[PDB]
Write a protein that binds this ligand. Structure first.
Ligand SMILES: OC[C@H]1O[C@@H](O[C@H]2[C@H](O)[C@@H](O)[C@H](O)O[C@@H]2CO)[C@H](F)[C@@H](O)[C@H]1O
Ligand SMILES: OC[C@H]1O[C@@H](O[C@H]2[C@H](O)[C@@H](O)[C@H](O)O[C@@H]2CO)[C@H](F)[C@@H](O)[C@H]1O
Ligand SMILES: [Mg+2]
Ligand SMILES: [Mg+2]
Ligand SMILES: [Mg+2]
Ligand SMILES: [Mg+2]
Ligand code: NA
Ligand code: NA
Ligand code: NA
Ligand code: NA
Lengths: 1021, 204, 203
């Protein structure tokens, strides 16, 4: 009766910040309750641990109040069978929502909306009775979003809040032998929601594991590990504190053993009872052991050396009651003199922020995925990750511990949508709620070596609640520093200056919470902390421009110790078309309102875990080896702090315009932070004209746990020389033949023919034989299909006048009208010469002026010359080039320039100058939300079909016009056009990326010169 | 002004104070006081309570106040009288010249305490000169020290009035009662009597 | 029904450190709500402020569970008339205890003892309706030791812990014009007790 919904729901615990849990047990590190040492030791699987994951019964309701009492007793008829864990929105029950800042619900804390989607989960299962006899049996919910009530065998059990941490309950008193039934009522909204405003998809359900744990009545209730070292790390002290629950008896003992794989390194045994702590005594129920270790093996992202620790609770006679264990890593994290140190050295964080997201599973995680991520990261030179913005699936930590990644554990608190942001955080009333959120995380994760920094959450302003919490940790766990960006990134609540989106050299002086250039920030009067950006280089779409600027600063300023890119994967979901075709969806794609469109897409990889081109730039900028070239010597520098170049091969090679003339292989031998000199054999001195370039690569001969054999970890290239061509084109036996008409001019030469329309002034068509070559005339082009960055947050409804796109639009760039100023033809002794002049205008203003010359000789080549003038008072144009639609369509693309991936002016350091050949398809970048893409710069020769272009330009080539791209919102809606679209740019604006909601392209990358010149050569084979 | 928190009987004393679980409870206790009394000029120091050992909960609370009300210092004696949780060294019952070196929470002579390596805070005894019955011997010793050492800024005597209650004899005669006088068990007898004045407010 | 003891006491909020209050308003400095400057200025007395101190009706029980639902509705027969504020031990209801360090009860947080002396206080009073028309009306307990539940006109209102600070509740929705009745159930032990071990008389 009191177990009745009617009654339980009476209280509406989900609308009371004062109630965050009911009868939930206390937090702690991971238990298995092994009943055998070896097992625990070898991390086998414990039988006192049982998963309840699988098929369950589900039913959905628009509101809690609509639930039926029967439910408690009996399963429903209309119930469905579902797999757990999972997100109900992923099963079509309701929609997933995608907002960033704005709360999905109405802001009226601590009130949630009357219509609050309820998910009734139920499960019937059997229990061994042996369990029922002795010991304790509890259930564990690794993750339930957002809040929920629980019943067992018809009996009300408890309540819980905080979608990201475990919830435990003692079932011991509700279990019957044999068949039992669980009834979990889960709710979308709760007061907890107010603390969970992360910019992610808003979902719900039992998205994390469910289990049962059988523990002895007298058991290990908790334990902590700590390492201490001597000044040189030649000796450590493992110190373990253990707490027990149960019946205290003098024959109880505890043994802690340290293992190095097969070897037992140290052991210690003792009886309960601590040292005096105060006037009343000590902890009778605790005990602390101290193990000494000589020449311990240190743990690091570079070399995750691990040890295993075993905690055995037993009697004096030797009888074991139970065992617990964990992996241990010897490392010391400390901030000293402005620097963040690890094991004595100063780190350089090559980090990234990462959400728990699966295109198919929603927020549900699994080993497989996790590992994928890890491997990728490692493979791309990352060494750290930030749990944006809640505690992760437990397994994660282990993996990181094992694989080697620095981690920032972050509390599940974001109140982004409040106003002002710290409205809650500065309120005592919410303190307790917040507290729970921090404390619990700590208790759970504190023994993992990979965790090196605690974080109080994200975007929640700065409030006293923070200060208090910050302090709490400090007292409880002094082994790791604490950071928090809210309220200015340098408050009393952070041990590190951890801004987000601060620029390298430019200040953004917002009131109250200005973002200084990072170099300046460091030097403010009185400032002494290290600086690490919690978020930077917004990777939304075609982005990452400027990345190198950061890396360079990082490398030059000691106190700038890196940052975490934003972010790992796109938060895109799959949908299907009627043909059962899957496609990537984003904000509003589920009729979800309100929503933030593509904003959920900012990763370096696609949800499927396929890389965006940007990834490469990252990998390159983050390499662990740095090169210097001096004469014939290569200087190599190691950015490793702990390892030696023991799996490194250096391949080098020389080529002339793509023609390889020499290669070499040299094994690396460099100590962490050391230098290696590399002597080059005498280099070739070709006569032929061209550019001589040197290229080095670093290879990993042997595979690793995270990499294959032959992995490339670093590269670098240099231009050795140049041999200017002083040659002359041999004579032609003939010369083109001009032919006027009213409409045009005709140039003929053999099978070749070119035509220029006299009204438009453009080269309208050209033939080879009887084959027309263009579907569209060759013309000047000044715009681009806006990048995400070009758009920012401008919306049709709510336009952002400073967005590039906005300006371009307003300027009429997108719709200016060309006007022939002049067009003439002339016959020279050795060729035909055409000259034109056009003007683009808009509303009486002249934006650009394009003056060209086309000169066709007897060799059949057409040389083009372009000179443009840009009004100083118009917004710098996205680009300056030409375009046309070629009638032909080929398989491959071959060029001599920067490659092979997409590269832009402010994003091309990772690219190499060579000869590339790819399939047309590869020249396209399937950004979910479409825009200008696939460009390659620094090109000297381009070949497609019978065509060849020469000069010095950048280009792109695909089947989609810029207009198409510009007019389509999803990749899945593009359809190839008739021939091949080609854009050849003399110049192209940068892409930016410092952030995606303001103009982020640096001046050096803007087309602000006023006058531009370029030349080109076109021919056929 | 002192928060309503004493866990004296725990064991060890900070059993609760060092537990997150009790944090919220404790919090309420502090926060609320502050919100209520902060505008009174007479209040010049906030105190986190009494005899509850020293626990993280304390640190957090200490900090909270500091942030919210920077106008007054915060003190707390628990756990040694000189923890990170107090702006002042505020022991109770430390002697003028003699040290009482209890393990973990020794009570140094107050003159010595001041000079410990690294110590810089002022010292004010939160409790001293136990006025139980025929007492107060030695009082002058303190006063003199106080007067001679700048950093010794005084203290609060323990305590004002006797905590005695009235009872009646059969002749309807009233009489002062103490521990166990109500059959109350267990009890601490006269210990409730340590004032400078009698409950009626008549001076000792 | 949900206002029923049977139901309310179900939860045993007094044995849960997680629950320290229910529907209690937020803390703040002292208000009078003067409606005239001068008054406030000269610290006169505000009429938006009313004392409920005086004679009330009291009844004592060895345990909460022993209370009678009737109580909610109707005053008791065996109820006594008492002055408030006051300490029930001072009226002979039970004994005052004098321990210093040692807890008066058994140490088993957050558990309190089954026999936990309950004091049922009740009060019937009249409310001007003008108050009932506009504005907000709340009640204020300057001090209740140690924990307690509250009802107004038969309706369950809230809960509170911490014997030394005020507890406030908005009555606005439970008041009727004219006659109203308050029912306050007060408890000796509560989880709060674990935080109130001062060496003083336990009342
Ligand atoms: O990828 C989204 C990021 O948004 C930033 O917040 C911006 C927000 O995008 C913008 O709409 C608003 O005008 O300004 C905010 C600046 O605080 C976040 F800060 C990032 O962490 C991402 O969520
Ligand atoms: O007036 C009583 C005072 O007792 C002190 O505590 C003593 C206690 O009296 C004694 O029985 C025990 O052995 O040692 C305690 C020392 O911590 C208090 F500290 C004072 O504040 C008074 O309560
Ligand atoms: Mg709640
Ligand atoms: Mg956000
Ligand atoms: Mg309680
Ligand atoms: Mg005491
Ligand atoms: Na640096
Ligand atoms: Na985003
Ligand atoms: Na002095
Ligand atoms: Na006393």
């Amino acid at each position: 009766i009191t177990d009745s919904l009617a009654v339980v729901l009476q209280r509406r615990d989900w609308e009371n910040p004062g109630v965050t849990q009911l009868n939930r047990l206390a937090a702690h590190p991971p238990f298995a309750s092994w009943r055998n040492s070896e097992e625990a030791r070898t991390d086998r699987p414990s039988q006192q641990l049982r998963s309840l994951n699988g098929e369950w019964r589900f039913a959905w309701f628009p509101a809690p109040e609509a639930v039926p009492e029967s439910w408690l007793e009996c399963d429903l008829p209309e119930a469905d069978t579902v797999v757990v864990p999972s997100n109900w929105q992923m099963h079509g029950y309701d929609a997933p929502i995608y907002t960033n800042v704005t709360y999905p619900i109405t802001v009226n804390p601590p009130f949630v909306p009357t219509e609050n989607p309820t998910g009734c989960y139920s499960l019937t299962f059997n229990v061994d009775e042996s369990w029922l006899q002795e010991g304790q049996t509890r259930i564990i919910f690794d993750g339930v979003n957002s809040a929920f009530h629980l019943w067992c065998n018809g009996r009300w059990v408890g309540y819980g809040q905080d979608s990201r941490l475990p919830s435990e309950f003692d079932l011991s008193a509700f279990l019957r032998a044999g068949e039992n039934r669980l009834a979990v009522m889960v709710l979308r909204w709760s007061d907890g929601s107010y603390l969970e405003d992360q910019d992610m998809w808003r979902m719900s359900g039992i998205f994390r594991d469910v289990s049962l744990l059988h523990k002895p009545t007298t058991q290990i209730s908790d334990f902590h590990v700590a390492t201490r070292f001597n000044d040189d790390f030649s000796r450590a002290v493992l110190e373990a504190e253990v707490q027990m629950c149960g019946e205290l008896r003098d024959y109880l003992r505890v043994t802690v053993s340290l293992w190095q794989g097969e070897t037992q390194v140290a052991s210690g045994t003792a009886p309960f009872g601590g040292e005096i702590i105060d006037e009343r005594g000590g902890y009778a129920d605790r005990v602390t052991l101290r193990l000494n270790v000589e020449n311990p093996k240190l743990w690091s992202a570079e070399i995750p050396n691990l040890y295993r620790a075993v905690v055995e609770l037993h009697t004096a006679d030797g009888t074991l009651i139970e065992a617990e264990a964990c992996d241990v890593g010897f490392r010391e994290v400390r901030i000293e003199n402005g620097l963040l140190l690890l094991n004595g050295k100063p780190l350089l964080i090559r980090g990234v922020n990462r959400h728990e997201h699966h295109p198919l599973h929603g927020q549900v995680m699994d080993e497989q995925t996790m590992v994928q991520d890890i491997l990728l990261m490692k493979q791309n030179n990352f060494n750290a990750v930030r749990c944006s913005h809640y505690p992760n699936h437990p397994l994660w930590y282990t993996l990181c511990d094992r694989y080697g990644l620095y981690v920032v554990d972050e509390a599940n608190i974001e109140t982004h949508g409040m106003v002002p942001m710290n409205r809650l955080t500065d309120d005592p009333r919410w303190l307790p709620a917040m507290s729970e959120r921090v404390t619990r995380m700590v208790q759970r994760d504190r023994n993992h070596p990979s965790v090196i920094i605690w974080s109080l959450g994200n975007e929640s302003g700065h409030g006293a609640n923070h200060d208090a919490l910050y302090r709490w940790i400090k007292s409880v766990d002094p082994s790791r520093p604490v950071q928090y960006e809210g309220g200015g990134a340098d408050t009393t609540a952070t041990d590190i200056i951890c801004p987000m989106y601060a620029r390298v050299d430019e200040d953004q002086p917002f009131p109250a919470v200005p973002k200084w250039s990072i170099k300046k920030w460091l030097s403010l009067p009185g400032e002494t902390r290290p600086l690490i950006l919690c978020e930077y280089a917004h990777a939304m779409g075609n982005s990452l421009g400027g990345f190198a600027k950061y890396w360079q600063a990082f490398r030059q300023y000691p106190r700038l110790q890196g940052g975490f890119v934003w972010d790992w994967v796109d938060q895109s979901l799959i949908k299907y078309d009627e043909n059962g075709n899957p496609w990537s969806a984003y904000g509003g794609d589920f009729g979800d309102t309100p929503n933030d469109r593509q904003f959920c897409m900012n990763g370096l990889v696609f949800a499927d875990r396929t890389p965006h081109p940007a990834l490469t730039e990252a990998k390159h900028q983050q390499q662990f080896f740095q090169f210097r070239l001096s004469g014939q010597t290569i200087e190599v520098t190691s950015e490793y702090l702990f390892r030696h170049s023991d799996n490194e091969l250096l391949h080098w090679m020389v080529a002339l315009d793509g023609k390889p003339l020499a290669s070499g292989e040299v094994p690396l031998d460099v100590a962490p932070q050391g230098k290696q000199l590399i002597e080059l054999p005498e280099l070739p001195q070709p006569e032929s004209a061209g550019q001589l370039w040197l290229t080095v690569r670093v290879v990993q001969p042997n595979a690793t746990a995270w990499s294959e054999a032959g992995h490339i970890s670093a590269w670098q290239q240099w231009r050795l020389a140049e041999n200017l061509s002083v040659t002359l084109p041999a004579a032609s036996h003939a010369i083109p033949h001009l032919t006027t008409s009213e409409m045009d001019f005709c140039i003929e030469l053999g099978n070749k023919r070119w035509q220029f329309n006299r009204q438009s002034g453009f080269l309208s068509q050209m033939w080879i034989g009887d084959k027309k070559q263009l579907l569209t005339p060759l013309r000047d082009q000044f715009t681009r299909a806006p990048l995400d960055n070009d758009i920012g947050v401008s919306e049709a409804t709510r336009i952002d006048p400073n967005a590039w796109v906005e300006r371009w639009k307003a300027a009429g760039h997108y719709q200016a009208e060309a006007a022939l100023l002049q067009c003439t033809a002339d016959t020279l002794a050795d060729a035909v010469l055409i000259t034109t002049a056009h003007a683009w205008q808009h509303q009486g203003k002249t934006l650009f002026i394009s003056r060209k010359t086309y000169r066709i000789d007897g060799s059949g080549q057409m040389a083009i010359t372009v000179d443009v003038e840009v009004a100083s008072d118009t917004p710098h144009p996205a680009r300056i080039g030409l375009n046309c639609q070629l009638a032909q369509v080929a398989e491959r693309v071959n060029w001599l320039g920067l490659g092979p991936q997409e590269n832009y002016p402010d994003r091309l350091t990772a690219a190499c100058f060579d000869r590339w050949d790819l399939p047309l398809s590869d020249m396209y970048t399937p950004y979910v939300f479409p825009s200008e893409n696939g460009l390659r710069c620094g090109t000297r020769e381009l070949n497609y079909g019978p065509h060849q272009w020469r000069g010095d330009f950048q280009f792109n080539i695909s089947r989609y016009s810029q207009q198409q791209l510009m007019e389509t919102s999803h990749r899945h809606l593009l359809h190839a056009e008739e021939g091949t679209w080609l854009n050849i740019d003399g110049f192209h604006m940068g892409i930016g990326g410092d952030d995606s909601w303001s103009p982020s392209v640096s001046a050096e990358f803007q087309l602000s010169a006023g006058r531009y010149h370029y030349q080109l050569v076109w021919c056929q084979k």
